[PDB]
Design a protein around this nucleic acid. Structure first.
Lengths: 129, 156, 144, 36
RNA sequence: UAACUUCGGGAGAAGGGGUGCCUGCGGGUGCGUAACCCGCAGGUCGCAGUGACUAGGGGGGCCCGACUGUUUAAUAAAAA
RNA sequence: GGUCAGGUCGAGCCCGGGCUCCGUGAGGGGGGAGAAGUCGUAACAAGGUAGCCGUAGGGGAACCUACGGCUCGAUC
RNA sequence: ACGGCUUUUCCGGAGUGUAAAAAGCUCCGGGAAUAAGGGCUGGGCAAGGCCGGUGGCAGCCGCCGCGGUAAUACCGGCGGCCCGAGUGGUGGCCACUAUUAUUGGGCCUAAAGCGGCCGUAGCCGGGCCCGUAAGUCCCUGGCGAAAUCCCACGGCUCAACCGUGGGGCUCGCUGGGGAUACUGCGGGCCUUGGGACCGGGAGAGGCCGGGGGUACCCCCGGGGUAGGGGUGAAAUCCUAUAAUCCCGGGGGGACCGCCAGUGGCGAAGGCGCCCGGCUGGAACGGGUCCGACGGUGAGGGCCGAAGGCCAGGGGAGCGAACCGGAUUAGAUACCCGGGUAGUCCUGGCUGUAAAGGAUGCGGGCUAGGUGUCGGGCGAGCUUCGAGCUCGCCCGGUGCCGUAGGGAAGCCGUUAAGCCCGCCGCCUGGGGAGUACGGCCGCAAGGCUGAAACUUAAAGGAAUUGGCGGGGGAGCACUACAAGGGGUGGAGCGUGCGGU
RNA sequence: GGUGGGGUAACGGCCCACCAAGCCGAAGAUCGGUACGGGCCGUGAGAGCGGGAGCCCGGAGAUGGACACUGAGACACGGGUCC
């Protein structure tokens, strides 16, 4: 059965990008998915997205700009300190500050660069590049 | 997929996204409550009561009406029945499963060579045990309640 | 035909148990842990050993090669076990006599066993009567 | 008996069914000789 | 409390400890301190306490006959 | 400190019972190596009766047959 | 080769050093004088196609491999290369090894998915709201000895070594403060996953009972003579006690022909004559009901082809064992004539298959095309039929095929593609599913399961060729079919083998 | 495990008398194999794997066992008793 809607959404995004789809629909909708999409839009990896009510968890409509090489959830959600980010960057990214490691912190979910700037850690919930 | 057969049948209900009852509903909340209690007195189950209301009285569903006695929850057939003191003593799905399990055991006693029916009985009993565990966790029945093939006849 | 498991955050016990269970299919690890080599090693896990020559024999070269390889039978002073030791050298056999003390040393074959076209022989002579066989063969030294 | 499917291949070996029959006979004979 | 086993046996295998008398307590069934049994503590005597009487010695191999049973009354009880 | 009695710790020796390891014991059983042996030809082509798996019974040896199964089966 | 220079080291000496010595240090006298070996030389791997010796012998070889009278691969000579006061040999550990795989391995055909299902612990778990701070993050006190490790400077000449400062290591523990995204915990609200229920249908799903289909076998009563059967050819065998064959009757025991289909139902094994009764599951259409109740599941439970076993019945046809006839050098077989167990029913045990989609199960996503089964919807015909044709949605069942995957064969929305979970299994070929031990079973057997030793390959996909007592085209008097003449039998000429 | 005591420099089934049936265990008790533990050392890009004799801290032993005297400290390597 369904286990991780966030992982489902990221895998679907990657699959549809590889064939060049312009639009995708994410179902079911969750606030974690919404925040991750917000971060991706802020960093310019996706286009406009919107939330649609359907009498259920909801749906997300997302526009793809053909910029994502690969996006995927990180599991298990490893906890990470401020000084323990280089190893994860080397593991999940091709080059320094190339992609974004989406991290859930005590002050909301944000990019690992933002987490470093704010001097806080959290858990690694996804990665995109 | 299905619990045991592992098939992917998708037939079901596709209700429209709604938040308030449609205007064309003839009856009011009190009238539909009275209709529900009348049907329960007639002797229908909750599902059959809902089906009758949907078919004959043109009420799409009672879940669209907000509960007058609790703004934080919507109405429901079981909630109305318990408000009027007519809810089942034990869950209806569990009752149906127990009834048909008892019938299957009665048939198997006459036909001991029906191994396929025996497997069906085993699946039914597994489902019954699952439901009993869930209702134990939710506290809907006594913690010491156990399913006995012998005692189930009395419940039936 | 599925994602390798367990992968949960709280499955460390099961993952460690699986690794421990399947590490026993490795021959090297099993041998090292159970000390199987030391149980049956004639040399008792030593680099070289000393013994007394009991007889001089020769072994046929394995196919497709051909020839007679001169070897000796040596009784180890450690436990009295009798083993076969190859005599490297063009004419090494003539420098070894019956009831002479010889120091044998493993043969550098695959793993630790035989080498070349002479299976069964795992050891080679090095020193005879406290004199090196290589020097004896080259003729600089003399057999005492 | 546990299975080795590759044993059924006939390249340079006897039929596995007859090997199995011989092994069963030998097991019974060994039991008889040991007294069990 | 072993080998073996036809799983019932072998078996009381083998092997080890105690055992009298006296002064009291406790338990069983019991109306009962009636009657018959079952334990506990202490003291004490001798070489020896089932002190007389009654009262198995044991274990490991092989052949024959499966077993209980019958036989030459009066030299053969056995593998017959 | 002698002698006697009692209470403890208690080595050593003896007996019985478990556990682990170590060395042999005439002979028997197969296993692997070897060489340029004897009998036949079982598989590889439709390998000359297609091959193979499970069970059962036979035969000097490879396999022979019966029941159920697969193609890892050539032809039409 | 000639002419010069220095003394780290070498020899002797004076001081300083040491508790006393010695070693070091400054200086003086002599003098290039006192000082290079080890492995390798076909590739992997830098270095010889040079010369003498041995001729599958000696030998070499970690692996490939070399030596058989022409050796750059063995021994030695002369060259050459790598390190160098070191250089080689043997055993052990790490890397090599993503061959132990959390990072980070595989299970269709190479080792590997339990034969299949249901479920206990464990692991993994739908959406929203509120509360706690257990986990998590940040800050701040007390700790985790020194030596060891890294950096800068300073002292032994620099260095090794020591000293002064800074950092790390001891995988962490503990007193407090803050955060609330996530996970845990408690409460509340939902329906998407999964269950329950109603409606019209589909199917060799299962059990019980009752009525049939021909066919085969036997027995009796008629017809009728001498054969029947069987093979490549025969024989055994049946037949005169009237066979084969035709007809009129009686009895029995298995199996349900064509229709039949890449068809349908079941977890799998498996399940086809026809009506009646009981019973399980699934697909479809549901503004129906409950409200996360779910997935996988070590242990454990249930089913499970054929064969086999226990006991009681039955036994038509087939047919292990066996007995006869043939073929063959032999035939314990293939072929033919008989034939017991079995195949069948009732009650149990056995739990084994190429039980193979050789592919575990649940969820989301990733071009299409074309058949067929069930259901629903729309349209057109209709002999108005539960009829026919076309299109669409859902669920099954096949084929081709794009992106992509793979060693390739091929798979490709029924993935063997990218992801999120759980269990099972594999770690070179044999030894070996063997030995020992334990559990189960009446037995046969089932489950569990090694070592010593041996081996360089075993194994998979595909390519070219050579073959087939495979197929299809062709050709040939050193092939045949139709024919002429001969040789093979005798003496001799000549050439071989032998003596 | 408890109720009450003895002994100990001290709490304690450490031991004693009396009450109950508790305690550990597939998250692997018991049993068997091996081994002094750590700071550290070897190796690898790292994850990790292997070792843990020499230097430091801690623990044990003095031919194999069992006992005691003196002393703050021992049941004491170059003190004592027995087998």
């Amino acid at each position: 059965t369904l286990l991780d809607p966030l992982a489902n959404a990221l895998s679907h995004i990657t699959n549809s990008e590889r064939v060049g789809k312009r639009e995708v629909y994410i179902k079911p909708a969750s606030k974690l998915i919404g925040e991750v999409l917000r971060v991706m839009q802020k960093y310019g990896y996706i286009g406009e997205f919107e939330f649609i009510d359907d009498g259920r968890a909801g749906v997300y409509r997302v526009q793809l700009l053909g910029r994502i090489n690969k996006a995927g959830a990180i599991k298990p959600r490893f906890p990470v300190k401020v000084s323990e980010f280089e190893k994860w960057e080397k593991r999940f990214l091709p080059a320094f500050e190339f992609g974004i490691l989406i991290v859930s912190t005590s002050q909301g979910v944000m990019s690992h660069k933002e987490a470093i700037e704010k001097g806080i850690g959290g858990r690694l919930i996804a990665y995109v590049y | 997929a299905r619990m045991h057969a592992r098939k992917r049948g998708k037939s079901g209900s596709k209700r429209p996204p709604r938040t308030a009852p449609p205007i064309w509903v003839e009856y009011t909340v009190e009238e539909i409550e009275n209709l529900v209690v009348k049907l329960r007195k007639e002797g229908y189950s909750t599902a059959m009561i809902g089906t009758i209301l949907r078919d004959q009285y043109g009420i799409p569903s009672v879940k669209l009406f907000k509960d007058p006695d609790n703004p934080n929850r919507n109405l429901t057939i079981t909630r109305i029945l318990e408000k009027h003191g007519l809810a089942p003593e034990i869950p209806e799905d569990l009752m149906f499963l127990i009834r048909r399990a008892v019938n299957l055991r009665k048939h198997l006693e006459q036909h001991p060579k029906d191994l396929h029916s025996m497997r069906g009985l085993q699946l039914i009993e597994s489902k019954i045990r699952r439901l009993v565990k869930y209702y134990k966790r939710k506290g809907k029945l006594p913690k010491n309640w156990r399913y006995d093939p012998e005692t189930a006849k009395l419940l039936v | 035909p599925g994602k390798k498991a367990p992968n949960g955050e709280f499955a460390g016990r099961k993952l460690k148990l699986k690794r421990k269970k399947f590490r026993w299919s490795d021959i090297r690890y099993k041998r090292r842990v159970l000390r199987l080599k030391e149980k049956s090693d004639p040399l008792e896990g030593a680099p070289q050993a000393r013994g007394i020559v009991l007889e001089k024999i020769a072994v046929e070269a394995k196919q497709p090669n051909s020839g007679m390889r001169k070897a000796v039978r040596v009784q180890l002073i450690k436990n009295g076990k009798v083993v076969t030791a190859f005599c490297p050298g063009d004419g090494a056999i003539k420098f070894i006599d019956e009831h002479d003390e010889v120091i044998i040393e493993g043969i550098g074959g695959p793993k630790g066993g035989s080498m070349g076209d002479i299976p069964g022989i795992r050891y080679k002579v090095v020193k005879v009567n406290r004199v090196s066989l290589k020097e004896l063969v080259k003729g600089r030294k003399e057999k005492p | 008996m546990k299975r080795r499917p590759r044993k059924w291949k006939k390249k340079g070996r006897m039929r596995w069914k007859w090997i199995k029959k011989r092994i069963r006979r030998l097991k019974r004979q060994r039991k008889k000789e040991r007294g069990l």
